[PDB]
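User: We ran a pulldown and think these components assemble together. Before we commit to crystallization trials, I'd like a predicted model of the whole complex to look at. Sequences follow.
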Amino acid sequence: PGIVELPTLEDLKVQEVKVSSSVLKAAAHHYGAQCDKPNKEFMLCRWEEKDPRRCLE
Amino acid sequence: DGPEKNYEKTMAILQIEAEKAELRLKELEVRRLMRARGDGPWYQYPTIDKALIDHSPKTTPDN
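Assistant: Here's a predicted model for the assembly, 120 residues in total across the polymer chains.
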């Protein structure tokens, strides 16, 4: 029943972090400890909205 | 004894029988509608209670 709204490919284009797993895991503790507030904002938005398209920004 | 005993006793018996007969006839109508639309006290078939649901946050955020 009706169209399912999907975000366009334009705003979807986002700089993707171009690093491997080892580099991520090696600095994961410091990465999580320092830059964490934007992660928490997105983490809360994903569990509260329950809709991925709402928190893409 | 006097005929007033039999007369008054019987008409009271007829009154009791009428209410008994009327209630049974109404009963088939009440029970019929209950089993059809089911918004009454009895005939309520069991349903899963809304208390078993785990509303705590899950591993997958969208669920």
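The interface with chain B takes residues 43, 46-47, 50-52 of chain A (CB under 8 Å). That may be worth checking against your pulldown data before setting up trials.

User: Thanks, that helps.
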